[PDB]
Structures are given as C-alpha cells and as structure tokens.
Design a protein around this nucleic acid. Structure first.
Ligand code: MG
Ligand code: MG
Ligand code: MG
Ligand code: MG
Ligand code: MG
Ligand code: MG
Ligand code: MG
Ligand code: MG
Ligand code: MG
Ligand code: MG
Ligand code: MG
Ligand code: MG
Ligand code: MG
Ligand code: MG
Ligand code: MG
Ligand code: MG
Ligand code: MG
Ligand code: MG
Ligand code: MG
Ligand code: MG
Ligand code: MG
Ligand code: MG
Ligand code: MG
Ligand code: MG
Ligand code: MG
Ligand code: MG
Ligand code: MG
Ligand code: MG
Ligand code: MG
Ligand code: MG
Ligand code: MG
Ligand code: MG
Ligand code: MG
Ligand code: MG
Ligand code: MG
Ligand code: MG
Ligand code: MG
Ligand code: MG
Ligand code: MG
Ligand code: MG
Ligand code: MG
Ligand code: MG
Ligand code: MG
Ligand code: MG
Ligand code: MG
Ligand code: MG
Lengths: 211, 169, 159, 296, 58
RNA sequence: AAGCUCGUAUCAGUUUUAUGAGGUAAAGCGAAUGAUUAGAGGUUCCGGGGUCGAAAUGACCUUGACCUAUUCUCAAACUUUAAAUAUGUAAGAAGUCCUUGUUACUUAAUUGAACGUGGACAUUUGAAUGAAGAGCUUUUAGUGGGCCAUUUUUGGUAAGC
RNA sequence: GAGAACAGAAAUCUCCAGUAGAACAAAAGGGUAAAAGCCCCCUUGAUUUUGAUUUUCAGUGUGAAUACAAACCAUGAAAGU
RNA sequence: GGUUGCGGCCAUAUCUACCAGAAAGCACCGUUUCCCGUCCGAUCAACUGUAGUUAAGCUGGUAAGAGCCUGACCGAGUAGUGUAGUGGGUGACCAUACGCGAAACUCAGGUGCUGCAAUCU
C-alpha cells in the first residue's frame, strides 16, 4: 500500500515537517542512528569513511532504515559488533502527503503518507569510524547500503580523524601535546579563551608544554 | 570588618493556616490581634482544592508582621516553647529562620474556650542596616554580597544571643 | 475566505528592532518639523495611535501641516496609470527628517563657496558633478614587487 | 549568588538593558515624556520645569528646559544658600522648601526682566492664588513642577517649594488639595494652617511641646537652636525676615572657590586608579601560568 | 464551468501606453486640510500685509 | 476622432550619485521558540524499583526524569544576522543669502509661525543618456471566455491537468 | 531554589533569583515592565456640532480608523491624557 | 579630575567574582509632636542634621571571566543571485559568460562617550 518511492523522489515541495499545524504524521521507520561501539573513545577509531550523496533528492525513512540494517548487518558479522561506529547523518523530517482516492480533484490536499529526509549534493548520509585495519570491511558495508538508495552516492575516505573535525596530523598535534580531553564518545579541546582559573583545572596535562 | 553591619531582626510574621473561613478564622484572627497589638490581615485562597475544602478567594487564613522590639518579645515568647532548640534546616540560605508551635497557650495567652486552641507559624526575617537600598523607591539597588544575610552568619547570631541550640547536622 | 485587514501581512514590518523594544526615546519628540520638510515614514509598532498604513512604510514625503502631536505628509501614490495626492496624518513617532536632501543642501552651500572663491580669484569655476571617469595611465614598478605566478589547483575533497 | 542561580550566556545575549537613568533608578521616563514634549505647532518654545529634589537634607530647585543634547538650567537655587538670607537651621523642612522656591522664583524673574512687574504675594497669608497675567503686559513666566519620583501626599513638602515659586511670581499651575491644612471629608483648605507651615509653625510648636515635656530629647535635636538662643516663638520672624532678604537681593552669590579647577583635578587624580595596558594584562597571565600551573 | 480567476498579465503594458504620468507639481499648493486655527489667523495676517502694501501706494 | 494652449520647452518602462525602506534566497541551531541522535559529568529529606535493614530527613547499587559542558540533524505558518532583483525620495530661479513689514494664531518676550516688501549671485544654473516636442480638453468603438514560453511558484503520484 | 505546627504533589507565611519565560474577553500576529499587566482612588469623552484624512476604491457607498477645529466635561500637584 | 541635580545617545553602560576609594557630595543613619500612609513609621509622610557609619548603595580597578561593541584581502569572491546561449545531462541537476555578492567561522582590538548647572583638596 506504500506508494513506490519514485513518486516522492525529487524535492518538489517546501519542507512540510511535523508541526502543530501537521500533528498527525506517522512514526519514522528509521529510529536508531548510532550503531556499533558508539560508546568508544575518539582515539579508538581514527579512520573515517562517508557515504556521500551526489544528487539533490529525497530519501525515505523506509529506505534509511533498510539501509541502516544492511550496512550494520554486514560490518558486525564480518568485523565485529563492537568493531566500528555507524552513524546515520540524515534525519527524515519532511512529510509526504497522499491524496487517498465520488469527488475528484476538488479539495485534493493530502494526509500524511510517510517521512523523508531532504538531501543535497555532497551531503553525507552515513558515517562510520574504525581502526584503519578495518577500512576494507567498512567500505563494503557502505557499498552494499547504496543498493537501498535511489540516486548516485559515492563512498569517500576522510582526511579527518574519526568523527572529529581535525585532520589526522592536526588532531595528533593537539592530542600528543596536551589539548585533547576524552568525553564519552567525543572530546573537548583546550581553548586559549576564558577563565584561566579552570582552564587549568581541566586540561592539567597541558601547561608543561610537553608530552 | 564589622562596624555597621550588625544583625537585626527585620520583622516577625506570625501565620495561622486555618483550613476554612467563618467563625474559626475570626477566632484565629482574634488570637493574632491580642497577641500582636496590630490588627491582622487575612489571606484568600489562591485556587480551589476540594480535598482541603477550599474555594478560590475564601479567606483561608490570617497573619501579621511585627517589626519593632515588640517583635522580640514575641520571638522570645515562642522560643521558650521550642526550649531554645531549633534544627539546622530551620534557616534559609538567605539568612532568615522560622519554626512552628501548636497550642498558642504555650506562649503567654490564657485559654478562653470561646476562642479555642490554634497553632502558629513563627517566621523571622533578618537583615543588616542599609537594607533600605532594596526597599525604597529611588535608586533601588541590591545589597552587596559581604552585606547579605547568610545561613552561616545567622546561625552564629542565633547561637550567641538567646543561648539556644542548633541541632542535628 | 480571504482576509485583508488594515494591518494584514505586517508581521515584521511593524516589528520592534531586536533588543530595541520599550519606550521610544525622548529625542524623537524633541525633533521639530515645519511645512515643506522632507520626512521618511517608518511606523513604530509600540505607538498604535497615529499610525501609517503599511503602504506608506518606507515612503518619503513633504510636510503640509503641523499639529499638536502630529504632522501632515503628502505622498504621491500611483493608482492605475497615474499618481494621486495622499494626505497622511501621522504622529511624530513614525516620521523622520530625511537626509535625502542633506547632501544637496550641502552641495549648494559649498557651491556658493567655490563660486565666491572663483569670482574673487580668476575665473574657471566648473562646479557640476561628474560621473566616475576611467583611470588615467600609470606606471607600476616591480621593485620589491616581482610578479608571482599563480596556477589553478588540483581537485581535492577533505570532507 | 547561588550555583543554581547563575545567568546563562544566552540570557545575557538577549538581554535588553533599560535607559541608563532608569537602571540608576533616577529618571521616570513615562513622566518625563509628558513633562517635556511641546505642542508641535509652537516649534521651539521650550517647556521649562520647576525641578524640585530633596537630598538627605539639602533642597534643590532648578528651572530647566530640554534639548536633545541635554537639558538646560535657566537658573538654580539650593536651600544651602538660605544662610545668606538668615536661615541656618532645618534647611530641609517645609518652610525651608518654601523659601527656596521663592528664591528660585525671584532669581529667574529677575534675570528675565519681569522682575519689577509680577511681585507675586507679598502679604503672605496662605490664601490660594495663582500669578495672574497683567492687563496689557508680558504674560507671566510659566513653569511646570517636576516632582521627580516624590510620592504625592497631601501635605508633602515638595509642594512647599511649589507654593514659594507660586508666591514668588512664577505661573506654576496647581491645585491646593496637596497643601498642609486641606480637609479630607470637605474639599476645603485652612489657610491659617498653611500659613503656619510657611513660617515653620509645626516646628515651632514642636520645640515648645518638647521644651516642657521631655527636655532630654529637646536637647539632642534642636541642639543648634540652643547654640544660637532661638526658642520657638522667634522662629516665625526668622523666615519672615528671610523672605525679605530674598526679595531684596536674589542675585546668586557663588563660592569664592578656593583652589582652582586644575588644583582640584590633580589632587583627585591621585586617588583614581588607571587601567592597564594589554601588554600589562598579558604579562600577568603568562606570569600566572608559570605560577599556578608550573607545579609550584 | 470554471474560468480564469484573476491575473495582472498585460496590465503594465496598458498602464504604459499613455503611461505613468508624473504628479504635476505646482507652486502654491492648496491649504486643503490645514489646521483651522492657523488658517483663520493666517487670513487676517494676509489681509494686513496687503493693506500695508496698498499703503505704500497711497 | 476632433482638436486646443504653448513650444526650448518641459519630458523618460534608463543609468549615475546621495539618502531611505524590506525579511525573501542564503544562513543559524555548542543564539530564542519548536523539532532531533548519541554518549559524558553533576543533582534529590524529594519518580518508582532492589541488598542490608526495627526505622531513619540511612548508607549503597538501579532506572527514570532534571542541571552542566559537549555531540549528529531540521522549519511555509522558527530566528540574531542577512543579500541579489525589485522599491520611496532628492540632484536649484517654484534656488540660496541678507535687510525687516503683516496677524485675531503663538511665545515670559516683536518670541516664533506662516505670507510678504526691499537687496545680492545667471546658464558648468549645479549628474548621465536621450527627446519625429510638451502640456490640456472633450467625445465615442470594440473588449470584459483567453492561451503559450523561460524564470519564480501552489495543489496533485502525475497530466498536452 | 531555599525556609515555616497539623500541611500531604497541591492550602497559607518569608526570602532570594527572575527580559517577560506571564497577563492584557476572544483567532492569530504584532505591542507593552516605576506599563499596556495586578491592587486601589475618582469618574462617564461610550458625550455635543458639522468638515478633512487613511484602508477597501471607480480614488462611489459602507464598515473601521487617523489628525485637527468648535463645545461641555473627567482626571491628575501638574505637564498632560 | 571627583561628586551632585537635570539629562542625551541607551550594555564599549549589562552580568559574575574580588579589591580600592582622600576631599566634598550622595548615602546609609536618629526621631514620631505635626501633615500624611500602612497588618507593620519596612515602603510612603513629617521632624532633626543633632546621635552614628563608609558596611552597604555609589564610583573606580582586577579577570587567558560570560555578554556586548569594533575591525580584518579570517573564512569567501564562498553560499545566494540579475543577465546569456539551439551549453552538458535520461533525469535529478551542473558547468560556463557579463555582473552583484552574504551569513556563520576565525583572529585582533575595546569595555561608556558626552550637554547644562552647582560644588569639592
Ligand atoms: Mg525547483
Ligand atoms: Mg507542489
Ligand atoms: Mg481541510
Ligand atoms: Mg539547507
Ligand atoms: Mg544507489
Ligand atoms: Mg561543529
Ligand atoms: Mg479544614
Ligand atoms: Mg489568508
Ligand atoms: Mg524593557
Ligand atoms: Mg483607540
Ligand atoms: Mg507620575
Ligand atoms: Mg459558469
Ligand atoms: Mg478550465
Ligand atoms: Mg473570466
Ligand atoms: Mg471564484
Ligand atoms: Mg513574509
Ligand atoms: Mg531556507
Ligand atoms: Mg545566520
Ligand atoms: Mg533550537
Ligand atoms: Mg558557549
Ligand atoms: Mg524564513
Ligand atoms: Mg528606479
Ligand atoms: Mg538631445
Ligand atoms: Mg523637436
Ligand atoms: Mg471609450
Ligand atoms: Mg467602454
Ligand atoms: Mg464595457
Ligand atoms: Mg464579468
Ligand atoms: Mg517566448
Ligand atoms: Mg493547464
Ligand atoms: Mg494576542
Ligand atoms: Mg513610569
Ligand atoms: Mg456609544
Ligand atoms: Mg479585494
Ligand atoms: Mg470615482
Ligand atoms: Mg453606490
Ligand atoms: Mg567623607
Ligand atoms: Mg526609619
Ligand atoms: Mg520619607
Ligand atoms: Mg568598601
Ligand atoms: Mg563601617
Ligand atoms: Mg546614588
Ligand atoms: Mg570577554
Ligand atoms: Mg543565478
Ligand atoms: Mg538546459
Ligand atoms: Mg549554480
């Protein structure tokens, strides 16, 4: 009963989110967005690979959820369920309407039919992080996921360290000096701004200007 | 450095939360009159509960605020009921303190069965000289930290005079 | 059905300028207007009395009347293929002296000056404004400024 | 303040501060707007204000007009001038406020020219009256009482200044229902009581009532009254003679000024800390990271 | 049978055939809507100066 | 269609300069509101469970909410910022300056306000480009089913809708 | 948030913080802090006379509104409204 | 220079935490006969300027402070956009030509200026 995805592929409308004006939209089929060893530390997974969109289209929630499962299934049962961290970087906030068909075109405004995630060119859809000794396995996970998506997407190796914003050497220079600070699954950095007082409480391994 | 930041009693407010209006309230009101000398104020209900048996604007209770060492004579009168032992809680982080005793007869006043027996809330607010800066109309400012009334600074004041105790942790 | 009230469509037009809500400051009432003055209309939302209808928002007109708390500004609004004359009665909160003629008045007084200086001296005033001319020739030296040779760069990603 | 009290950066970012003279708790703009603004068809005609302000015991009366660059003091008179006119005590009482306003009246009315004409009330009997315009003459100088933040109570002393400038020849429109000696249940004014406040009759009667009931208090306050041999009864002819002293010569003597501005400036410039340079501020930080962080 | 609802199509074309005419300024515009208390005085203020000018040609 | 009054005259689906107005595109979310993923550190005399317990305003695990600093993602009916295109006004003789009459308005005031008399400076007289000229009046036809294209755009899976 | 007999999640009393996160009949959006919100005090300008003006526009009507004029009033110490 | 009263612009003025302040002025502060206001002379009114104090207000200074302001060929000639073609591509969309051109980011600087009147080592 779900219409073929082809009906809703292009971004033909202005965003129609769930709102106090909408109120009546079904749940999203993709509901988890971080899989694998998401608790892991930033130093644990330097290598980072992206599933990157090459079109300006719409990805259904049903096709995100099916692709999340495909990529996460393959990686774990080849590399390990705590061998990587899958992160879905795309959230289905756009509502798709449908004119459920006596009356004809008169008053054709539709009821919510499903959710989709609007996606630009170059926009990142999946992101995984691993030890570089798992690059192969991870890329094959994202390559299999592509078959669940309309439109061309390309897998790309990051210049950056894990999910960080700093490239591999630039992150090392900061960590191996003193300025990095583990925080759950991400990291806090030492700023040269603010209260000098507690800028030394935290980041005590600094201010020696050494290892 | 303490020349002029002494620790006076700003005012004492007694409060009788009768759960109803009518005779019981004016009777409890009459308790505060002969006790404070000042004529008391009654408070309406803020909303309706129906398990406390009150409607909005129902003149639930009565209370009265007393400055002016007349206040001290009632604070002591009730501290005698508490036997000059308060508790550590008893004392706002902002420096005031208060307690509650039932049977208003335990402080002076005789019985008179036509009035009954009522309980009270004793609440004492403290301040230092120059608290007017916050209370006046022109150039209304806020009192500096090293002049604000603290919980520590009040408990020591309360221990010192009345020679009372400050119990559990 | 549609809605076309006096202030429809005016969510942000009449909005209050972020962090500038509150009472209008006192200079706005200390200003003094006379007939013939050129004013700019910009309605103030806090002052609902004497307000201009949204159409005259952003518009500039001439004062034709001065009253206790208000000014009369004539505006040429065009309806059809012509303009018609519009008398507006605005409070002094929505009117503002227009610098659209300050430069002109500046240029006149400075043009009387140059002309007196020319007539007192020898002739050749030449006081009309002239548009931006093309550059004259020039010599550009290379001393300490030897030309660097840039090339286009190859494709990269760094995502 | 408390740990669970501190203001977020978002709070501070979106916070609109009031006008400075409002955060200082000094200027009521909602009043000032309606006091200052002129009828637009009078075009430059300034609205003057009879500003009255009470310091802790010094009375200030200025006649003030408004300009976008700042207000303009046409003339001022302080009750600390009253010694010059024979008043040394209670320079903040009701009759002190009357004298000051009278002084503020005569002084400007002098420097405006409507001085020989518009003498106001000279037979002061506390009757209610406004300065009436001369038949075929310059209309009287019109000023409007700027009370400030003073709370209007019937019998307040801001209106003593008002009575004096009104009795001085200024046109200050006013009703009499805020003058001491105004009855509540009948809308009428006892002028005998208002004349009493104009000459310090409530203080005279007090000095009498303490002279024979509690002389321990009559000594502490009214100390200076002893130091000059001024019992009560004579207190009326002090303010009566001061009124004349004011109307005889209001010309505003200033101070002999004793250490010219430059000299005043140097002495205070000592006691004024001066800011640090960014190099100074940087040196204190680099010194701090050597100190607090350098493992002692 | 529905038909077209509305359009501004071609309207500027027409508006420009005899197109938009400037507002035709005049020296001495009218006093229409000017403050009556002002206009009443202004009247006598013009009567006088006129009488004054005729008095230079007595 | 008839013309009429004038004609170096004023005129402009245009640029330039000067000065306004606007909340769209973008952008923003470790900024408000409202959504949304993940941990990490805090908080309970005080949300419910659980060991010891005679209880505790008792300790210790636990899970929820909240607070703190972070983290992935969003808005036609969200937003601090904020375009491009469009858009108001001004670029002089109906101008600028000076001298000082008129009034019943207005000012404490021959103060101001408006309208003037007398006087001073002409075509580089106040940007550009253009102009088979400019202004004005009357009277009347046909029309009041429209459709297409690029761009912006609503409904609809869509349509030669 | 921290404090007060019965008193409990919710009764009344006090202090601190508090850019409005409230309230302003009603839809929503503007607007508002010594107010435009809450409490009190005095009131009838929700009045008299006929014009001009803005939106809708044909620059008709109606509705609604704006700034004066000419009265008589209200309120406030007053400017004012 | 300081302080005051009245201000203009309305955070470079606000906020948090500390310290410093001569002189004068503000201020806190004493009193309740009087006018006047309260449940309370707390606020408001009156009286003293005497009995007391810089503790607070106030003013300034400190902070790899929060906020705020300013600048920058910092990012970025980027995003977006007006104009053009019988340009590319199944399309989605995208380059190109003549123009206009952001925001965030980042970094550096700064933390009230000033009008009238009176007053002060
Ligand atoms: Mg499109
Ligand atoms: Mg659509
Ligand atoms: Mg419907
Ligand atoms: Mg976007
Ligand atoms: Mg694919
Ligand atoms: Mg980031
Ligand atoms: Mg009960
Ligand atoms: Mg509509
Ligand atoms: Mg405000
Ligand atoms: Mg109204
Ligand atoms: Mg007032
Ligand atoms: Mg039909
Ligand atoms: Mg059709
Ligand atoms: Mg049709
Ligand atoms: Mg229709
Ligand atoms: Mg809009
Ligand atoms: Mg957008
Ligand atoms: Mg932005
Ligand atoms: Mg948000
Ligand atoms: Mg931050
Ligand atoms: Mg928007
Ligand atoms: Mg144009
Ligand atoms: Mg030509
Ligand atoms: Mg020709
Ligand atoms: Mg025709
Ligand atoms: Mg026809
Ligand atoms: Mg027809
Ligand atoms: Mg028809
Ligand atoms: Mg075509
Ligand atoms: Mg069609
Ligand atoms: Mg509303
Ligand atoms: Mg106010
Ligand atoms: Mg009616
Ligand atoms: Mg219509
Ligand atoms: Mg018509
Ligand atoms: Mg009709
Ligand atoms: Mg001193
Ligand atoms: Mg007192
Ligand atoms: Mg007082
Ligand atoms: Mg100190
Ligand atoms: Mg001290
Ligand atoms: Mg002060
Ligand atoms: Mg900072
Ligand atoms: Mg474009
Ligand atoms: Mg094409
Ligand atoms: Mg493009």
């Amino acid at each position: 009963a779900r219409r073929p995805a082809r009906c809703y592929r292009y971004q033909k409308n202005k965003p129609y989110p769930k709102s106090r004006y909408n109120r009546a939209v079904p749940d999203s089929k993709i509901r988890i967005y971080d899989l694998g060893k998401k608790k892991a530390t930033v130093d644990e997974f330097p290598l980072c690979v992206h599933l990157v969109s090459n079109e300006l289209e719409q990805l259904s929630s049903e096709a995100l959820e099916a692709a999340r499962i495909c990529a996460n299934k393959y990686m774990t049962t080849v590399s390990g369920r705590d061998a990587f961290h899958l992160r879905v970087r795309v959230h289905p906030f756009h509502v798709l309407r449908i004119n459920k068909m006596q009356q004809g075109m008169r008053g054709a405004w539709g009821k919510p039919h499903g959710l989709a995630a609007r996606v630009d060119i170059g926009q990142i859809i999946f992101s995984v992080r691993t030890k570089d000794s798992n690059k192969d396995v991870v890329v094959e996970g994202l390559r299999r996921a592509r078959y669940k998506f309309p439109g061309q997407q390309k897998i790309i190796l990051s210049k950056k360290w894990g999910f960080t914003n700093l490239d591999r050497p630039e992150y090392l220079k900061k960590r191996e000096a003193g300025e990095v600070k583990d925080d759950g699954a991400f990291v806090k950095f030492l700023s040269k701004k603010g209260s000098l007082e507690n800028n030394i409480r935290e980041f005590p391994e600094y201010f020696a200007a050494q290892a | 450095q303490n020349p002029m930041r002494d620790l006076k009693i700003e005012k004492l407010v007694l409060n009788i939360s009768v759960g109803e209006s009518g005779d019981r309230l004016t009777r409890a009101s009459k308790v505060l009159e002969q006790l404070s000398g000042q004529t008391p104020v009654q408070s309406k209900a803020r909303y309706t509960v129906r398990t406390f048996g009150i409607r909005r604007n129902e003149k639930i209770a009565v209370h009265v605020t007393v400055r002016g060492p007349k206040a001290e004579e009632i604070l002591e009168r009730g501290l005698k009921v508490k036997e000059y032992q308060l508790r550590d809680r008893n004392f706002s982080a902002t420096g005031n303190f208060g307690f509650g005793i039932d049977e208003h007869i335990d402080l002076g006043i005789k019985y008179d069965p036509s009035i009954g027996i009522f309980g009270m809330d004793f609440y004492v607010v403290m301040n230092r000289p120059g608290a007017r800066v916050t209370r006046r109309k022109r150039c209304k400012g806020t009192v500096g930290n090293s002049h604000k009334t603290t919980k520590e600074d009040t408990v020591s004041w309360f221990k010192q005079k009345y020679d009372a105790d400050v119990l559990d942790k | 059905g549609k809605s076309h009230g006096y202030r429809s469509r005016t969510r942000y037009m009449f909005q209050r300028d972020f962090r500038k809500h509150g009472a209008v400051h006192l200079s706005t009432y200390l200003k003094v207007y006379k007939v013939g003055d050129i004013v700019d209309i910009k309605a103030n939302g806090s002052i609902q009395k004497g307000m201009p209808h949204k159409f005259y928002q952003g518009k500039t007109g001439v004062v034709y009347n001065v009253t206790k708390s208000s000014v009369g500004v004539i505006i040429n609004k065009m309806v059809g293929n012509r303009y018609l004359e519009k008398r507006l009665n605005l409070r002094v909160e929505h009117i503002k002296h227009s610098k659209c003629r300050q430069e002109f008045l500046e240029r006149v007084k400075a043009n009387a000056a140059k002309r007196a200086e020319a007539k007192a001296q020898g002739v050749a005033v030449q006081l009309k404004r002239q548009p931006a001319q093309p550059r004259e020739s020039r010599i550009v030296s290379t001393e300490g400024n030897v030309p660097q040779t840039l090339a286009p760069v190859p494709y990269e990603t760094f995502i | 303040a408390f740990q669970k009290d501190a203001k977020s950066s978002a709070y501070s970012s979106r916070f609109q501060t009031p006008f400075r003279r409002r955060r200082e708790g000094k200027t009521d703009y909602y009043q000032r707007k309606r006091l200052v603004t002129q009828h637009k068809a009078k075009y430059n005609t300034p609205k003057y204000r009879l500003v009255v302000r009470f310091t802790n015991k010094d009375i200030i009366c200025q006649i003030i007009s408004s300009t976008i660059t700042g207000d303009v003091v046409l003339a001022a008179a302080y009750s600390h001038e009253l010694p010059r006119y024979g008043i040394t005590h209670g320079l903040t009482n009701w009759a002190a406020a009357y004298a000051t306003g009278l002084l503020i009246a005569r002084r400007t009315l002098q420097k405006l020219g409507l001085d020989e004409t518009y003498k106001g009330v000279e037979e002061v009997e506390g009757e209610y009256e406004l300065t009436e315009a001369v038949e075929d003459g310059p209309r009287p100088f019109k000023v409007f009482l700027d009370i400030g933040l003073q709370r209007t109570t019937t019998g307040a002393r801001v209106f003593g200044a008002l009575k004096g400038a009104s009795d001085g020849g200024l046109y200050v429109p006013h009703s009499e229902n805020r003058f001491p000696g105004w009855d509540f249940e009948t809308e009428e004014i006892d002028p005998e009581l208002l004349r009493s406040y104009i000459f310090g009759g409530h203080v005279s009667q007090y000095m009498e009532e303490l002279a024979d009931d509690d002389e321990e208090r009559f000594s502490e306050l009214f100390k200076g009254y002893l130091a000059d041999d001024i019992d009560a009864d004579s207190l009326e002819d002090i303010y009566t003679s001061a009124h004349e002293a004011i109307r005889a010569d209001p010309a505003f003597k200033p101070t002999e000024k004793k250490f010219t501005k430059e000299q005043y400036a140097a002495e205070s410039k000592k006691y004024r800390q001066t800011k640090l340079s960014k190099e100074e501020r940087a040196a204190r930080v680099a010194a701090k990271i050597a100190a607090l962080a350098g493992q002692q | 049978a529905k038909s077209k609802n509305h359009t501004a199509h071609n309207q500027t074309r027409k508006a420009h055939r005899n197109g938009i005419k400037k507002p035709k300024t005049y020296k001495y515009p009218s006093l229409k809507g000017v403050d009556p208390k002002f206009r009443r005085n202004h009247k006598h203020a013009l009567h006088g100066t006129a009488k004054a000018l005729a008095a230079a040609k007595k």
